[PDB]
Amino acid sequence: YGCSFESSNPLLAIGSLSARFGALYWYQQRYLSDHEAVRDDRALTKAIGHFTAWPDAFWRELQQMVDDALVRQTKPLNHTDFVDVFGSVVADCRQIPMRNTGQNFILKNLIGFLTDLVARHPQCRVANVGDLLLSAVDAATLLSTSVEQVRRLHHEGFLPLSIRPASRNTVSPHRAVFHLRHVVELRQARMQSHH
Amino acid sequence: DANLKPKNIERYELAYSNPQTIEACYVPPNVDELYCRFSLRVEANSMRPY
Q: How many CA atoms lie within 13 A of A62 on its CB side?
């Protein structure tokens, strides 16, 4: 009904109401997968405790699935889709309606993590994590901008395309084609703002 | 197309090469000079209609 908080240590304890609503919606689909039992009070009541160690737990949830994915590998990683390892955790960032990083704190932590992941895995002769392919709609989300802007950014040569398409065809938004390390670096280099 | 509409071609579609098969000829390494020769005959044959 209102916020009214002070000494807001948890990442769920600050902000405008729309964000506070979005954070709960996200928590629910992701951890309350059990079918509705109209436990309208009890089901959501737990979300606050959950977030109290967030700055240090979210990363472990992401780390766990890097390893479980790795041991099930069937192709060299540089032809593997980003989605096969992280399971659309990126798309879920779109459920909070705000676009910028300083307000959408879920996206802010996911990017933090991916930047570190790339940093500890530099390029060498054998491919490794960080060379995964992103689709056009994924870069748009990580770069905090609409899709048409990515097409314009490609056209000017600020980033490379890795898969050669056939002639008399087009690459659709859903096709996986940019390397992760290329997107992370470009964003640090030329996409920052006061937000 | 008739200097009017530029054709529909997507950007990436012109970065492709165009392969071709050609014959060529070069002087091999370490030859000091090349020679060319021919013969010529001249006849006094414009004096009368064939």
A: 21
